[PDB]
Design an enzyme around this catalytic site. Structure first.
Site, PDB file in Angstrom:
ATOM      1  N   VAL A 163       6.295 -77.695 -87.578  1.00  0.00           N
ATOM      2  CA  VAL A 163       6.897 -77.160 -88.796  1.00  0.00           C
ATOM      3  C   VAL A 163       7.748 -75.919 -88.524  1.00  0.00           C
ATOM      4  O   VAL A 163       7.384 -75.063 -87.712  1.00  0.00           O
ATOM      5  CB  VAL A 163       5.818 -76.846 -89.864  1.00  0.00           C
ATOM      6  CG1 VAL A 163       6.448 -76.379 -91.167  1.00  0.00           C
ATOM      7  CG2 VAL A 163       4.947 -78.076 -90.118  1.00  0.00           C
ATOM      8  N   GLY A 202       4.406 -73.391 -86.963  1.00  0.00           N
ATOM      9  CA  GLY A 202       3.262 -74.174 -86.486  1.00  0.00           C
ATOM     10  C   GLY A 202       3.650 -75.519 -85.891  1.00  0.00           C
ATOM     11  O   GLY A 202       4.667 -76.108 -86.260  1.00  0.00           O
ATOM     12  N   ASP A 219      -0.928 -81.031 -98.592  1.00  0.00           N
ATOM     13  CA  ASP A 219      -1.599 -81.825 -97.566  1.00  0.00           C
ATOM     14  C   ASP A 219      -1.855 -83.243 -98.046  1.00  0.00           C
ATOM     15  O   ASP A 219      -3.001 -83.636 -98.312  1.00  0.00           O
ATOM     16  CB  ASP A 219      -2.905 -81.144 -97.134  1.00  0.00           C
ATOM     17  CG  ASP A 219      -3.255 -81.389 -95.681  1.00  0.00           C
ATOM     18  OD1 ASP A 219      -2.442 -81.022 -94.796  1.00  0.00           O
ATOM     19  OD2 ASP A 219      -4.365 -81.924 -95.422  1.00  0.00           O
TER      20      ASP A 219
END
Ligand SMILES: C[C@@H](CS(C)(=O)=O)Nc1ncc2cc(Oc3ccc(F)cc3F)c(=O)n(C)c2n1
Length: 345
Positions: free
Chosen positions: A31, A28, A161
């Protein structure tokens, strides 16, 4: 000393990592999945995109690193490594963060279906364990949702997160999961919010795992509050006083009053202890919400609760949050945090 770094173009950027990290593949900043030959772990490696482009960005970068370095808990994302190819502060421009490679998030697991009660017990237990640790350090997640909860094969969960930019106005608009788990006081900026915003989120998540359905799937902010108030009742005089926003308070009093619904009629067939706990988490007045510490002690988690196996965190100094610095100063602080990092056992 300094490891040898090698370069490789992946997701449109030139990645420069220590040789220990092999088989880099995009998943992603951006990442990559990798294999850490030094630990034997599959890891995720994040390269931050323009980490020092503005004061806002340099400070966010520092916040994320500070947050990730503090986390030392089984049910919270931990930092395996952080590195820069830079040899000095003057050369320093790129920051790479390394954590465990996670398998599936909670959206992948729930997938429109009910989970067994014991599975719900186990998952929520771990979330609350992690939250207890996070809240003990005066850290608030603020953005708890199924996509931020990752789980392995053994259903062993971690909260993810931290230090992210947090969603803008456009991605909080409409029929979106980015807003369905948010406490009302923070969704509509009622007041200065506390740790129990995260407990609202756990309630929304727990209901979803129990029924297989989003609890408050609002098509917008107002629709969502209406669904919320239909379940929990319209606020009393006590809570209205606490809504320091005068406009927000004024809008609430315009709504037709509604009593709190019977949760056992809403969550048909569910464990009465789950229902009781849901009722204590989904309280409109944040002052009256159950805490993580109190919820762990609730009878619903009898089979998992161990007061001696639910640790608190070391103190987290976030005085920097109210500090005004230049880009180069946040950048120097960030650099000190990279070079001082000590890897886990
Ligand atoms: C296949 C997915 C399953 S998923 C989405 O986790 O459920 N695996 C996975 N595992 C870990 C991360 C970590 C991420 O961010 C980081 C945060 C902190 C760090 F130190 C390093 C990171 F890379 C990340 O953005 N993604 C997308 C990740 N994806």
């Amino acid at each position: 000393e300094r490891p040898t770094f090698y370069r490789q173009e992946l997701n449109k950027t030139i990645w420069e990592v220590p040789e220990r990290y092999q088989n880099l593949s995009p998943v992603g900043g951006s990442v990559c999945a990798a294999f850490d030959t030094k630990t034997g772990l599959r890891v995720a490696v994040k390269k931050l995109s323009r980490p020092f482009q503005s004061i806002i960005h340099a400070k966010r970068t520092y916040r994320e690193l500070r947050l990730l370095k503090h986390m030392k808990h089984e049910n919270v994302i931990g930092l395996l490594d952080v590195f820069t190819p830079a040899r000095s502060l003057e050369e320093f421009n790129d920051v790479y963060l390394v954590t465990h490679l996670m398998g599936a998030d909670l959206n992948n697991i729930v997938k429109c279906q009910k989970l067994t009660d014991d599975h719900v017990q186990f998952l929520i237990y771990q979330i609350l364990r992690g939250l207890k640790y996070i809240h003990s350090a005066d850290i608030i997640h603020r953005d708890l949702k199924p996509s931020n909860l990752a789980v392995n094969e053994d259903c062993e969960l971690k909260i993810l997160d931290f230090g992210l930019a947090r969603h803008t106005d456009d991605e909080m608009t409409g029929y979106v999961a980015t807003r369905w788990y948010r406490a009302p006081e923070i969704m509509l900026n009622w007041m200065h919010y506390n740790q129990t915003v995260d407990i609202w989120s756990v309630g929304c998540i727990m209901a979803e795992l129990l029924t297989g359905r989003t609890l408050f799937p609002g098509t917008d902010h107002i629709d969502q509050l209406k669904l919320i108030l239909r379940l929990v009742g319209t606020p009393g005089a006590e809570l209205l006083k606490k809504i320091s926003s005068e406009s927000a308070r004024n809008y609430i009093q315009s709504l037709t009053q509604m009593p709190k619904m019977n949760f056992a009629n809403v969550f048909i067939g569910a464990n009465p202890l789950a229902v009781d706990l849901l009722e204590k988490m989904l309280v409109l007045d944040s002052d009256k919400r159950i805490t993580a510490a109190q919820a762990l002690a609730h009878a619903y988690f009898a089979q998992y609760h161990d007061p001696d196996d639910e640790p608190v965190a070391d103190p987290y100094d976030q005085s920097f949050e109210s500090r005004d610095l230049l880009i180069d100063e946040w950048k120097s602080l960030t650099y000190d945090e990279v070079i001082s990092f000590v890897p886990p056992p």
